[PDB]
Amino acid sequence: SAPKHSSSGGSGGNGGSAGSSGNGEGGAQIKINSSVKDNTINEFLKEGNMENFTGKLGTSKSFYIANDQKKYVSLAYVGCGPANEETELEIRKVAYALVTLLHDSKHKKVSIIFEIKIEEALFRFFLEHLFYEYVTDERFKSADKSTETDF
Amino acid sequence: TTVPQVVSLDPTTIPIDYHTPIDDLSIEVKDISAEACPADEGLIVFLLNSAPKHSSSGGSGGNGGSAGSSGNGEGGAQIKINSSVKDNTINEFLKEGNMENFTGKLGTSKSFYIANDQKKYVSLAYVGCGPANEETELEIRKVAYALVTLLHDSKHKKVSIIFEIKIEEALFRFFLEHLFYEYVTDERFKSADKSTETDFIKNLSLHIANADAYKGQIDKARVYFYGTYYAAQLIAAPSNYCNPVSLSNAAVELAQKVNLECKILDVKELEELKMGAYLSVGKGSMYPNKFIHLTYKGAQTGASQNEKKKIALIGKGITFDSGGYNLKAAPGSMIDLMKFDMSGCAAVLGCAYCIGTIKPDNVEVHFLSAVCENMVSKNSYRPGDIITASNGKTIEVGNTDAEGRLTLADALVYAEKLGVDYIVDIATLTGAMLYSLGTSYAGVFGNNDQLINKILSSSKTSNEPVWWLPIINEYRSSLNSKYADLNNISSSVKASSVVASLFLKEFIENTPWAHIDIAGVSWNFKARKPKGFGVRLLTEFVLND
């Protein structure tokens, strides 16, 4: 999340409550990206296509868009919360929002971009909880048994 | 009339939004044989049926219909968008499908912003509806819920929905109404996120096959939606906001703007009608008892071409139900949700709005409700008290928490003296409806088979699930009292809904009567909000007489 201490669409905290209606001047969530393509790597780049994201926590926005050659790529945005208020609860919620995007068999190759500043232990924990949410337990099902090769 | 206050910070009015964002929504229905939507569009949704094969090797198929081969899972086919959207270099992508992992079970949407012939992103979407012709009201509710979760992105001022499914016209109307009901949120009691901005939708273009048979449902869906939303707004209001006087004022103000004859009765004129059972329930409250009596008189289009059906609709109308001295102390008593015990009255008032707007002909509806509170105080009625109703029968109050059937008894005796043909009451009477029909069907009892058949035929059209339940005259002696004429509860019978209708059947003399028990279906427990159940059912009942 870009802004801080405002109340028109979110909660503040009064670390300075000088207006900021709609966050007022807290800004957008423009990303410092280097995605090499042009079509789907310019809007999700310097340009602005952040229509209603407002990344509270979870609240993803997946979309299959064609990246400069062909082949809709399904770029996505996932919300993590304020800039440095990242704890294990935030990481668990983000991993849960991210595996709900991964449950589409169309993806055999995934790229995750960390525009957030987190520790190394928290990075390890993000990886582990991503794996833990991704892998499902199917040992006691009659149908739904033979795990497909779409991971 | 003035609402009594304990402190000066008490509320004096129910806040009501008489103007919804749906009033500004411009809707239009075009035949699916010419779309031309995506070129300069904002959002496009596709409702697609799943294609489950003769059996599922992992696809959750069910039975062996005409075969049981079940190859490749359920590989009988794959979903393909059988309509092209005339945006010529868009409909190309429509013929290619690009259906990567959709498998439209139910809900399970896939929002995606493919670019148009401009660096604009349209956010085309696909929403799953289920098998090809197994579309009921549950499917429609789930699809509307999945579709409003895509609408909560303020980027869209013009939505466009494409119906690749084959549904009825009543189901189409119900889809529209439930879409509106999910879309509009209640923000009357918030402090932040209060002032609504310009983020809502301004256009809604629906594309369906044979659209001229559907474009008569638009105005009916707007009226039905607002009736349901008004009712849900009354139910969701807390009891420090919705008291008997506040609700009386709301009914007056509603009848003022739908041009109904309002007539509120006070305790002075309730004592002259001998309404002792209704008065004993409201004794122990700080708010006076208010009896609402609205009236819609249709325009006589035919002197003898028809007969003027006179109907009386009655609601429970208990703004808070603590149980009285039989206090709701047990586990699972749901005393925190007992603000919804006026759901029948709210349904009657919503249907009053609906019928004052539609204005049917050759009909006369009486909208009755005995509003009161069931509170504990020193003026409360006590378990064991003997009260006299308006027809003369004496009732022993074996349970102060069975208070709705007393106010309904007095209201029924009042309704029979008006001279109506049908009496239909609707009430959140018994908590036993949750163990019998659950949270999806409302039970209907009665003393006339033609009236119950009319109510069921109107439940078909309005898509409000009603199931006919029996009035078992074998438990009638369990209401026998040693000293009074009746007891209000059963001694050693646990079918509380059947006993409640047996009790209420003793106050109807010679009139066709039915009772709709909505105790289980009023509150949506998972969403924590009211459903507004009953408005569309009662409206479609009145309109088809």
Next chain:
Amino acid sequence: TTVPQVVSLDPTTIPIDYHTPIDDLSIEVKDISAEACPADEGLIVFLLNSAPKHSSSGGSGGNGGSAGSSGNGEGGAQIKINSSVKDNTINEFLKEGNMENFTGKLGTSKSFYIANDQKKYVSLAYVGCGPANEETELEIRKVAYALVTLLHDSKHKKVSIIFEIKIEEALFRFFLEHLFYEYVTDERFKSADKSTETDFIKNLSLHIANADAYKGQIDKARVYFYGTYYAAQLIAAPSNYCNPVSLSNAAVELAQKVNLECKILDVKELEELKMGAYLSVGKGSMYPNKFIHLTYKGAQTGASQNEKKKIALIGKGITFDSGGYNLKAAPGSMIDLMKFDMSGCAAVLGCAYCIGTIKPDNVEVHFLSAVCENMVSKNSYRPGDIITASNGKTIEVGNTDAEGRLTLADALVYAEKLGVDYIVDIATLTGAMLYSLGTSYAGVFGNNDQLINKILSSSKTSNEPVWWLPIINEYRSSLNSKYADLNNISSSVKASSVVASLFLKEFIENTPWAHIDIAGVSWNFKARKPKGFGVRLLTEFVLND
């Protein structure tokens, strides 16, 4: 097979009376056109209706017909005039002013020993039936109950009953059956009061108007009485007498005396059928699991006379239901009455007797029942266990007290593999039926409307009240399990009967199926005895197919 014993004083058999006082009771039906009764016959009963209507103050019958000029009771004279001069010319000298102050509301008998023509006393009586045409099954039950209380005087070896009421033929048959059921007493478990004596009746004359339309119901009433009496004898037997082994032995004996194909399945052949859900319930018992499979093959009276309907009737069959590790410890759990949890199996066995005696044509019935106990021990199944049914689906046991639907699931998968047209399960499944329909109506669920209509039309004739209840597919996702295919109970739905029917609907593939929930209507709580519910219903269903 041999019943296991903990101590040598354990019982090894269910005591069954195969010969009732009714077997030697000579019945006869003669037209009321000639009585010739009073020649010294121990008892003479008169069934008389209430004379007036539409009044109150001692004859309260609601309002709606005239409601005017009651004066001193009813609007008219309000006294009954007995026809049927009783062909003596000196007993008809008593049809003048007896005037019958009993005013026969319902029951209200009045016995009296007038003298006939010499110094013997005939004990003529009058019994009240109610209004002149509002005669239902409840009235008939109450009249039979009042009439046996006059029959418990050993002075009567001959009885004459006079029907001055106008009733149907099916209701006349039901009156006969319920009279027999009230008359005979269960004396199998007494120490004194054991040796039955001559005191029973030896003749029974029934005088009815146009009796030739009724005298075909006599044999059917005898067969139906004994089927119901056999079922009630099985249900009334305690669990140290009625265990799975004793019950399978009783079924073998029954099939021997009515010439059915008996086939009991032991645990060895149930393990090869993969009946894991039925075996897990019976794990923690000291008695082996027994699967009864009787078969009636009707005589093919014609090759292409009809289509041979093949029916499978299934009963629950849990000889004792403790709850397992979800022990029945809560108040109102009725654990001392849980011997009645084999009422479905007992109804199926009584119907087996009825159909083996009647021997219909062009029908093939399969009488299935998976018999076990639900005990607490160290070998019992636990809450959370995952078991596999015989069709493959795994089931998570979220509640060990929901054990009837698991054994019924396995029995249903077995019945579907026989190749039948209809499956009808009957079971005391959910204790929630007591809050939905109470103790008088059984609820029927199903997946086919023609089969449910057949069951309702056969409940009309057998006079066993059945009410059609809905299978609500909205609650199907509350049976979803994280690890198994289904859970056996619902997370956050209290409609227990609808959820049980949803669970059982998952084990039927492509067959018309219905399920009768008799949990509430099989035990007569006021009389502390079983009703035998379901025998006549199932028999009339089979006989009309």
Next chain:
Amino acid sequence: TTVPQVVSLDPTTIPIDYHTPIDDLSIEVKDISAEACPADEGLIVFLLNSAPKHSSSGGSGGNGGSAGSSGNGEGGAQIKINSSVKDNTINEFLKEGNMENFTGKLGTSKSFYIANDQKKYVSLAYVGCGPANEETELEIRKVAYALVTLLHDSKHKKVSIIFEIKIEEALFRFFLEHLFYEYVTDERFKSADKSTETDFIKNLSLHIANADAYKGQIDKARVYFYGTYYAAQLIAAPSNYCNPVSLSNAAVELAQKVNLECKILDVKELEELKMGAYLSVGKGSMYPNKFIHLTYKGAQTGASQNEKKKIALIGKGITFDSGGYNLKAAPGSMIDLMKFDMSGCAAVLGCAYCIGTIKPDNVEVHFLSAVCENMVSKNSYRPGDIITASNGKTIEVGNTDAEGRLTLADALVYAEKLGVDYIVDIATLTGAMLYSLGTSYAGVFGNNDQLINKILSSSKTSNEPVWWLPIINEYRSSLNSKYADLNNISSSVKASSVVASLFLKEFIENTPWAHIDIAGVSWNFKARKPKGFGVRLLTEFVLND
């Protein structure tokens, strides 16, 4: 202001003893290097540690100072009082050990009247303290309890206590205070047993080693004792004596006698502050809502000597807690002890006495408390009501028994507008603290680590056990409401204290804040009296700023 009365025998004041036996008790501390006590004395006590023996196989010495140590009760030594005594009739009566039975575990007193130089019996005694250095607050409480049971003999006007144990100075002060607290008895509500007599002590000599480091604690112990005794007198007063009006009168009187600025706020000025959450709780009472606001302004000893710390201390103050419409009906609800629900307010008032007497410098404390009742009547607030706090947030009342956090919310919004550096609440908030820390430790929550460290460091010195508990922001979404800003209780989280702290954290904007949950540690259940918990803790917190 005047206390309202239902009957004329209603009490109109809280009886308070402003003069205790301790005020007349002359205390003196002299070094143990010269006792000279028993020369013309009345009572002498000796506090002696358990003599260390071994890994005791004769009493279970506990852990492994040695493996087994081969001691078994006689491991290393026995006890010997090696300090002094003056009169050598008894001085040389204990020099030869003379114990022979003692083994001073904990408590375990042995009083005995030996003559000395007269026939005067002096009643020298011995009290056990435990191991030689494991002296904590629990040991000191037990020793003081055993020592007052020897003081309840009126023969003693002089007492000498000999400290042969090695303890700190804060623990010596705590010993003095708890001795005084056990000694004085509350006799305000007796009929006999009222008129206190001369029997109390008039002198108290304490002989300790290096006594000049201890004789500064005497005045602090007297002030702390009276603060705790005042608080316990308020808590022990029943609710017909301690109502909001009586309590605000008591606060006015206290502020008058310790020279604080009293300021009581009535309902008129609370309606203008928009304190709707605090007024809704007190709606249904017969007593008006009172808001106590005392103020201590320390003498600015220097202009820029320090920064003048401004502290706000807040107490819960619910003179009787019935639960409201969520009545305390369940078992173990302790509704007869709910008079102690003003223990936070009483601790704040006792601390007000302590700080008005000590008069620290460079500090400004605000003693706030929102006093009301939580009663059931016809004017009370109901479950589901939506109320507005004085900062604008709306609150849905999902439970009327969670009333302390609403009044605390309003008091916190009031305290933040004063402009303080620290806010500290103290409240008997959640009955769940009994399952988490029991009856000995109070839990402290907070939003600042330096403030919590200050509270813990002041619990070290005051010897009131406090344990730091976490505010878990993961449960914040369980307080989300559909219609209001927050709910006052949690949907599906049972950690009630963490949820209460999460709720209160929503009404603090930018101020260091901490909250002490004393629900479990304020009532001594075994002695059936209040502890007075929190007075010494809050005083030592304020004095060390």
Next chain:
Amino acid sequence: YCIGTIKPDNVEVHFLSAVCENMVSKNSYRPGDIITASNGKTIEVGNTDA
């Protein structure tokens, strides 16, 4: 009634009864209240149902 009708001799009966209700209101006595009787003894109300 029976004794006013029979009218026995050499007897004097006092028929006493303290009539009241035990209701829940905002004027009710609470669990824990301490009340004084007519002989002076104070009573702690540990249970309002007794």
